[PDB]
RNA sequence: GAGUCGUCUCGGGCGAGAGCCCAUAUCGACCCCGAGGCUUGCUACCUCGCUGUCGGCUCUUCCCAUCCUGGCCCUGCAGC
RNA sequence: UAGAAGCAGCCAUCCUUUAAAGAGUGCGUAACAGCUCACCCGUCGAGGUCCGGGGCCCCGAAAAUGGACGGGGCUCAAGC
């Protein structure tokens, strides 16, 4: 598994919480994941720290910014998570 | 062996002579092909190298008016052991003066036939011994006469798409008869906004009388 | 929102001679990239990363890389 | 060590081809019979995108490449097995004796091998047929895989090293498996 | 004579080393060390 | 001549000076260039020492010929310039015993235990030319394969190779 | 091999022992002693050496006609240069040299039997021939 | 007895050369590297308030680098 | 030298003509022949063949009352 713009959570990571989605694929070893301020969510690398994917995917650009990623992310409805 | 070295000096070649054949010098040896090459010096012409740099009539078409090259063309006709004959020899005299000069090129044995191969009817000129026995298993009836021994009548030995035995080949080999060619076959010639192909090149003029 | 591929350059000195690397990761800090040579080269060479000189990171672009391997890989990333 | 990122490849399945896919395990079916095999290797998910099958793991390595090909070629034996089967034709040669090659049941049994007094006998697997006619044999089959060890089975019953390997030669050996082997 | 027979049984090398039946032409021992093989056993002619 | 187990080593000391000790042996190698002048071509291969040893005369002898030999059949002497560098000059220390058991020793701890010469050695170190083979490119190939041939006789090993130097 | 055919070996200007003649036979269709009268005339050279030569005959009309695998090139020189024997050690004992204008020469009669082109390479093809020795 | 392993046993590499042509079926110099502890020697660690010598006999266990037996490969393996 | 005809061996190893051609790679005769290669235009239409350092794991690696990394057992580790 794991694509781009496929929905996730983790256990881990910087809070945790918490949802977050993978935004480009770094290597093949390591994954960046961001996501919205209003979770409390920030840019950060991670090479699975339990990242499981959700059911939901939307569509992100390959190489993106929380205003395009912010805006599939809140009509999908998960922002608030 | 140098690139646009060895095209160039092709280059310069193909401008020079009105006529540009691709010939299969694979058949060959060698002992015919070599001395093909010589002859063609002989007769006017000389025939060459290059392997994509043969592909490269395009550049000499290029250069000039024509229609000759990979691009307007219909397909280029080059296949392996192609070689490149430029000569002021005319394409039927060509194809012609391939065909006859050759030396000379048995059937070999387990090989498949280009075409169908024939013996002729006459006296071997060869004295009798296990040699009559040898024709008959071929399929070649034969007899003894004037005390040489002789072939019975004309017949197809083998088929064309058929393979040749290896006893048919060494007895046809022994009688001297070669059905086979191993001068150089033409793939197509080029002259003068035309491409000329192997069933347009050979003419039986003698066939065409015959025919009416 | 960057990724960008990092040409490390760099020698290592293992038994009194001189091996060259250029190490391409990519990351998104030079400090990912760092942490990563340390570790690779450590790893395999058999050699401590105090015995690791780093002459040079550049970033360069990650649409494009100057081995084969490292291109080929960054093509879908 | 050859290295992509999807590391991916791709097994055209023509129309008479039906392929079906439960996790790592294939079974494959076309107008005749089926056949199943799992493929094992860690890592490795078969699945079919539309009227294509891929074999993928994210991870290049060397072995990966080469099991992920073999997959490949499995495919490949099933989809020339289950449309019209494979065919390796066999010789009995013999040296001195009259060497009897019959089918009696689900076991082939070849007699006076070397003027022996004893049956050898060598095992026919549930997918295959074997036909003597004369003394060309032809082993006849849905797979490749089964066909290919039944005929081998029936060589390795003639197997002969306790004399002289140039002047005994007497058994059923391999003219045709699909194309001719061989020359020395 | 010769050549289904004699292909299995003849045409094939033979291992310097540990004496082990290869193929007809494979470059390196299968196993007892990258030895270059030789072929055959022959003593047909 | 007793196996090579003290000739592997550099850890022991020198006695070499030839002049300066009552009794020295004589030598194996008589031959250490062949062929033509070294200045008649262009190309350098070595042979290059990894190891610290003591290479045996009789090692050099034996490694030497079925080098030379090999070179001189196939290419001929007409041809390459090939010089083992070394001459061993570190002389070599023996202990006597022998059989002759029961109530015998042979022996003896001490009462002179110091040496009677076996021979002679060199003295390799790291990146020494053990050998140094001149040739041309054609040449190149019988070269390499005699330099193979001689590491094996080397006292322990090579791990810096068959060395193109290349003719600087 | 060679085979022991119709090709066979016979020394300079002799004939007729019973065992190579004999047995290998040259018929005119007659016995030899027809072959006999021809090869020791042509040969003739004050020595014997072994010259290739081939015979044809199918037990038939049985007629001969023979080559001199002799003659080729290397007798050619031999007259030119003056000097009988070839030399028994090549490049190492050069025993003559020929000058350009005597290579010219066996060249222009030997076209025929060559393939030799223009007259440069039959005299290059005569040449290397020349440095041979043994 | 332990340690050691020059010697001893066995094993490996290189392959000069011979074997009808053919290094490597077989035979194998020069030289080089290992394993064992079964011969000898070195050692003096243990024992001189005595662990009784050899050989044999009798009785039993173990090791394989295997003489046969079994299953095998090569061959200059025709058969035997 | 019987023969040495590319192919016991020694030495020269040159020159002509070009898909291309080594005074020839192996087989084959003991030695003309025959099978064949390097080689080459060439079809399939690519990312390819080299060589050379390094880490690590494999072979090399057989022993004597029971074998053992302390033991168990461990294999994306409880290893390196």
Redesign the pocket.
């Known amino acids: 598994a794991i694509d781009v713009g496929r929905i996730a959570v983790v256990i881990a990571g910087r809070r945790a919480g918490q949802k977050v989605v993978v935004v480009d694929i770094i290597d093949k070893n390591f994954v960046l994941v961001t996501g919205a301020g209003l979770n409390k969510v920030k840019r950060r690398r991670m090479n699975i720290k339990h990242i499981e994917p959700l059911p939901q995917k939307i569509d992100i650009p390959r190489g993106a910014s929380d205003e395009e990623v912010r805006a599939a992310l809140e009509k999908a409805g998960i922002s608030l998570a | ?1 140098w690139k646009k070295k ?1 095209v160039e000096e092709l280059a310069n070649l193909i401008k020079s002579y009105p006529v540009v054949a ?1 010939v ?3 058949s ?4 015919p ?2 001395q093909m ?2 002859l063609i ?1 002989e007769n006017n012409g ?10 490269e009539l395009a550049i000499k078409k290029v250069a000039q008016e024509l229609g000759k090259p990979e691009l307007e063309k219909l397909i ?1 006709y ?8 430029v000569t002021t020899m005319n394409p039927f005299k060509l194809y012609k003066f391939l065909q006859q000069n050759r030396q000379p090129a048995p059937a ?1 044995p387990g090989a498949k036939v280009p075409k169908d191969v024939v013996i002729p009817a006459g006296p071997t000129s060869l004295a009798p011994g296990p040699i009559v026995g040898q024709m008959q298993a071929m399929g070649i009836p034969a007899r003894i006469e004037r005390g040489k021994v002789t072939i019975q009548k004309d017949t197809v030995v083998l088929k064309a798409g058929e393979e040749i035995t290896p006893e048919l080949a060494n007895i046809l080999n022994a009688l001297g008869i070669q059905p086979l060619e191993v001068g150089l076959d033409l793939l197509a010639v080029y002259e003068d906004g035309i491409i000329y192909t192997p069933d347009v090149l050979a003419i039986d003029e003698s066939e065409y009388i015959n025919m009416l | 929102m960057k990724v960008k591929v990092f040409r490390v350059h760099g020698y290592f000195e ?2 009194g ?1 001189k ?1 060259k690397f250029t190490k391409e990761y990519r990351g998104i800090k030079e400090e990912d990239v760092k942490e990563l040579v340390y570790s690779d080269i450590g ?5 401590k990363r105090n015995k690791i000189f780093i002459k040079e990171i550049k970033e360069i672009r990650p649409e494009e890389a100057e081995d ?1 391997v490292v291109r080929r890989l960054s093509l879908e990333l | 060590m ?1 290295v992509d990122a999807w590391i991916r490849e791709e097994v055209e399945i023509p129309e008479g081809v039906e392929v079906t896919v439960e996790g790592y395990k294939v079974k494959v079916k076309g107008p005749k019979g089926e056949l199943e095999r799992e493929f094992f290797w ?1 890592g490795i998910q078969i699945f079919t995108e539309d009227g294509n099958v891929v074999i993928y793991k994210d991870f290049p390595r060397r072995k990966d490449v080469a099991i992920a090909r073999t997959f490949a070629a499995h495919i490949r034996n099933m989809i020339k097995g289950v449309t019209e089967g494979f065919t390796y034709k066999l010789k009995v040669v013999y040296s001195h004796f009259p060497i009897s090659v019959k089918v009696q049941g689900d076991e082939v049994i070849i007699e006076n091998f070397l003027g022996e007094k004893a049956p050898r006998k060598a095992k026919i697997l549930p997918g295959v047929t074997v036909k003597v006619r004369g003394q060309e044999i032809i082993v006849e089959g849905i797979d490749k895989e089964a066909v290919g060890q039944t005929a081998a089975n029936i060589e390795q019953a003639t ?1 002969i ?8 030669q007497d058994g059923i050996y391999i003219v045709e498996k699909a194309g001719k082997p061989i020359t020395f | 004579r010769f050549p289904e027979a004699e292909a299995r ?2 045409k ?1 090398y ?8 290869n193929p007809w032409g494979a470059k390196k021992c299968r ?3 990258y ?2 093989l ?6 047909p ?1 | ?5 003290i ?2 080593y550099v850890d022991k000391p020198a006695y070499t000076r030839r002049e300066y000790i009552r009794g020295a042996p004589g030598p ?1 190698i008589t031959i250490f260039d062949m062929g033509n002048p070294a200045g008649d071509f262009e190309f350098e291969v070595s042979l290059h020492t ?1 190891e610290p ?1 003591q ?2 005369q ?6 030497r ?2 080098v030379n ?2 070179l ?3 290419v ?4 390459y310039h090939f010089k083992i560098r070394v001459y061993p000059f570190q002389v070599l220390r023996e ?1 006597p ?14 009462r002179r235990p110091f040496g009677k010469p076996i021979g002679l050695a060199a003295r390799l170190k790291k990146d020494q030319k053990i050998l140094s083979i001149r040739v041309n490119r054609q040449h190149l190939k019988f070269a ?2 005699g330099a ?17 130097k290349e003719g600087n | ?7 066979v ?1 016979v ?1 300079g200007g002799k004939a007729t022992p019973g065992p190579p003649l004999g047995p290998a036979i040259g018929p005119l269709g007659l016995n030899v002693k027809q072959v006999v009268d021809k090869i020791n005339e042509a040969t003739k050279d004050f020595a014997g ?2 010259v ?1 030569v ?1 015979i044809i005959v199918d037990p038939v009309t049985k007629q001969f006609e023979i080559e001199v ?1 002799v003659p080729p090139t290397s007798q050619l020189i031999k007259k030119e240069l003056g000097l009988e024997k070839g030399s028994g ?4 004992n050069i025993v003559g040299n020929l000058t350009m204008e005597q290579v010219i020469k066996i060249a222009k009669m030997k076209k025929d039997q060559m ?4 007259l ?6 005569v ?8």
């Open positions: 062996e060895e691709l299969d010098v694979s060959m040896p060698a002992y092909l070599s090459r010589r010096r000389l025939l060459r190298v290059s392997r994509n740099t043969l592909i280029n080059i296949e392996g052991g192609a070689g490149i004959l070999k | 293992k038994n001679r091996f790893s395999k060479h058999k050699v084969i | 050859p860690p197997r090293t306790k004399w002289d390997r140039r002047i005994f | 049984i003849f094939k033979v291992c310097l080393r540990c004496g082990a039946t196993k007892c060390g030895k270059r030789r072929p055959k056993a022959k003593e002619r | 001549l007793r196996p090579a187990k000739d592997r194996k990894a040893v290479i045996r009789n090692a050099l002898e034996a490694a010929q079925q030999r090999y001189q059949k196939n001929g002497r007409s041809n202990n015993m022998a059989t002759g058991r029961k109530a015998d020793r042979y022996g003896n701890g001490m390499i394969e193979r041939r001689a590491a094996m006789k080397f006292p322990c090993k090579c791990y810096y190779r068959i060395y193109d | 091999m060679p085979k022991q055919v119709v090709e070996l020394e050496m072994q290739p081939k695998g050690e090549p490049k190492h393939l030799a082109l223009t440069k390479a039959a005299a290059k093809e040449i290397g021939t020349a440095l041979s020795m043994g």
